[PDB]
Amino acid sequence: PERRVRSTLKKVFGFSFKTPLQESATMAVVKGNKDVFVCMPTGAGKSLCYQLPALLAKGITIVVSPLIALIQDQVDHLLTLKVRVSSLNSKLSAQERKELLADLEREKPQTKILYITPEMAASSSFQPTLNSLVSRHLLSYLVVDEAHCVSQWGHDFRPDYLRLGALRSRLGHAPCVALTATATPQVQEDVFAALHLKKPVAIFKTPCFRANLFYDVQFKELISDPYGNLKDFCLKALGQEADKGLSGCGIVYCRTREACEQLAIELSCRGVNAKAYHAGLKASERTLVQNDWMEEKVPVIVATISFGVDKANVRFVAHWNIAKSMAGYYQESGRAGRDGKPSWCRLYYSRNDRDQVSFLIRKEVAKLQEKRGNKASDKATIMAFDALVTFCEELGCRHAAIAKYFGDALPACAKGCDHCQNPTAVRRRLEALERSS
Amino acid sequence: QVQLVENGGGCVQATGSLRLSCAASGSIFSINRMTWYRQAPGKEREWVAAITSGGSTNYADSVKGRFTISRDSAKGTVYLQMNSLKPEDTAVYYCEAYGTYTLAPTGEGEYDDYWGQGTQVMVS
Ligand SMILES: [Zn+2]
CATH class of the missing domain: 3.40.50.300 (P-loop containing nucleotide triphosphate hydrolases)
Structure with a gap:
C-alpha cells in the first residue's frame, strides 16, 4: 500500500514528496489501473512520478525521450542511486548496443529502466526485442517524456512521435505515462489522442495560480x-x-x-x-x-x-x-x-x-x-x-x-x-x- | 466523477414542441463533443444531432429544420429545441459527453467519456 511507497521513496531516493500533487500522481501510476498525464514544470518532480513506480513494479519500464542530452543527465544520477538503468541510442557502439539487446532477451534481465529514443523504439531492428518482452509479461510501464512533441500545435513537433500511438496499442497490458512541462488544452487533446491513451486518463497538471x-x-x-x-x-x-x-x-x-x-x-x-x-x-x-x-x-x-x-x-x-x-x-x-x-x-x-x-x-x-x-x-x-x-x-x-x-x-x-x-x-x-x- | 442528467421531456401532441436541457456536473473545463441520441422502443439507438466545443452543429436528416442544438456557454449546458414533433420522435433521449476534460484547482484531473441517465419523450 502507501506503506511500500514511503519506504522505497526513503530506502532509495532518501525522502516526503516536493508537493501533494507530485505525491498523488506517483500513487496513481503505482495502482497501474489507468494511463496518466503529468504536466509539471522543470522542478523535475515529474521524473520521480515514473522512476519510483518503475522499481515497485517487478518488471521493465521503457522511457521514450527525444534527445541524448535530456536522457544522459538522468541515467548518470539514476546509476549513482544504485539503480539498474540503461540508455539505448545509436550514439552507442554496436557491441554496447548488442550487449543490451541480449540483456533484454534474458528471462530476468539486469535492466529495470530502459531510456530509448523514439528513433530506436520505432526501428524494426528493436520490435522483436519488444515483442519478446511483451510476450514474457516483462513490460511494467511505457513512459513518453516530451509528450507535447506529438502535437503540431506544440512548439517542437516530431514526426517520429506519431509512431508512438501504434506502440502504446501493441503494449496494451502495460500502463502508459506521458509527461511534458508545456501543454495548452489543444496539446493535451493531441497527446491523449495521438498516444492512444486509455480513459479514464488521470491528469496531474501543476496550476499556474499564485495567491501572492x-x-x-x-x-x-x-x-x-x-x-x-x-x-x-x-x-x-x-x-x-x-x-x-x-x-x-x-x-x-x-x-x-x-x-x-x-x-x-x-x-x-x-x-x-x-x-x-x-x-x-x-x-x-x-x-x-x-x-x-x-x-x-x-x-x-x-x-x-x-x-x-x-x-x-x-x-x-x-x-x-x-x-x-x-x-x-x-x-x-x-x-x-x-x-x-x-x-x-x-x-x-x-x-x-x-x-x-x-x-x-x-x-x-x-x-x-x-x-x-x-x-x-x-x-x-x-x-x-x-x-x-x-x-x-x-x-x-x-x-x-x-x-x-x-x-x-x-x-x-x-x-x-x-x-x-x-x-x-x-x-x-x-x-x-x-x-x- | 461526472454526472450527465437530462431534463425537459414529457408527453406532447403532434406538431408541438419541447426543449431538452442536458446538465453536466463536476469540475468540467471542456467537452470535445456533446451529442443527442434517442432510443425508440424496439429500434436501434439513433444519432439525432451534435455540437462541438466552439459551436459547430450537425443534425440527422430525419430531424433537420425541426430540431436545433445550442450551448449556454455561461451555463455549461446544451439544449435540443425540438419543434414540429411527430410520433416517430417518441423515444428516450440521452447525451454523450465525449472528450470531457475535468480539472480541480489542486491540479488533479481526468479525461473520459460520460453517458446521460435519459428523459422520456412521448408524442401522441
Ligand atoms: Zn481576479
Whole structure:
C-alpha cells in the first residue's frame, strides 16, 4: 500500500514528496489501473512520478525521450542511486548496443529502466526485442517524456512521435505515462489522442495560480503621465517595509533596447534608480548591471526579452510593452514574488504596441516559412499572441484568463486582480478605450 | 466523477414542441463533443444531432429544420429545441459527453467519456 511507497521513496531516493500533487500522481501510476498525464514544470518532480513506480513494479519500464542530452543527465544520477538503468541510442557502439539487446532477451534481465529514443523504439531492428518482452509479461510501464512533441500545435513537433500511438496499442497490458512541462488544452487533446491513451486518463497538471501575485492592466492611451504612473507603481511595490525604507527589487520589460535605455533614465529622473539591460551592452556591462540588481545596489532593472537569475524578493514586474505570447507574459511576469510575500504584476497596454508586435510576430513567422515551409505551429504562434490581447481588452479575472489559456481550473482569486477588486473601474477603463478608439 | 442528467421531456401532441436541457456536473473545463441520441422502443439507438466545443452543429436528416442544438456557454449546458414533433420522435433521449476534460484547482484531473441517465419523450 502507501506503506511500500514511503519506504522505497526513503530506502532509495532518501525522502516526503516536493508537493501533494507530485505525491498523488506517483500513487496513481503505482495502482497501474489507468494511463496518466503529468504536466509539471522543470522542478523535475515529474521524473520521480515514473522512476519510483518503475522499481515497485517487478518488471521493465521503457522511457521514450527525444534527445541524448535530456536522457544522459538522468541515467548518470539514476546509476549513482544504485539503480539498474540503461540508455539505448545509436550514439552507442554496436557491441554496447548488442550487449543490451541480449540483456533484454534474458528471462530476468539486469535492466529495470530502459531510456530509448523514439528513433530506436520505432526501428524494426528493436520490435522483436519488444515483442519478446511483451510476450514474457516483462513490460511494467511505457513512459513518453516530451509528450507535447506529438502535437503540431506544440512548439517542437516530431514526426517520429506519431509512431508512438501504434506502440502504446501493441503494449496494451502495460500502463502508459506521458509527461511534458508545456501543454495548452489543444496539446493535451493531441497527446491523449495521438498516444492512444486509455480513459479514464488521470491528469496531474501543476496550476499556474499564485495567491501572492496581483495582476492588473493599464492603458498607456488613458494616462497623462505614463512614466509617473510607473514610478508610483514601483514605489508602492518597493517600500512594503518602510522601516527598512526601500525593501525589495523589480523588473521592467521592453521590446527594444532604446525603450530600455530611455525608460531607465525616465525612472532614475523621477527618483527610482533603474539601469538598462540589453544585448546592445558589452558582455562586461551586462555582468555588472546584473550584479548591482542582484546585490540590491540598484532596486530596478529595465530589460529586453534577453533576461538571464532567480531572485526571491522581486516585489514587481512591469511590462511596458505587451509580450509576444501569453506564455512569455506568464513566464516573465512570474519572476515576481518567489519568496511568497506579496508582489505586483502590471501590463501597460497600447493598441499601437499590439499592432507593432502583431506585425513583428508575423514578419519572423514569415522568415521561418521561407527557411523550412508551413507549420501548424505558425498558427499557434499567432494564437499565442491573440490570447494576451484578449487578456488586456476583455473584462474578467486576470488570473482566470491565464488559467483558461493554460488549461487550469478557475483559480481562488480573493480580490487578487484589478477586475476582482473593482469590476467597475475596469469597465470604466475599457469603456474609455472604446471612446478613444 | 461526472454526472450527465437530462431534463425537459414529457408527453406532447403532434406538431408541438419541447426543449431538452442536458446538465453536466463536476469540475468540467471542456467537452470535445456533446451529442443527442434517442432510443425508440424496439429500434436501434439513433444519432439525432451534435455540437462541438466552439459551436459547430450537425443534425440527422430525419430531424433537420425541426430540431436545433445550442450551448449556454455561461451555463455549461446544451439544449435540443425540438419543434414540429411527430410520433416517430417518441423515444428516450440521452447525451454523450465525449472528450470531457475535468480539472480541480489542486491540479488533479481526468479525461473520459460520460453517458446521460435519459428523459422520456412521448408524442401522441
Ligand atoms: Zn481576479
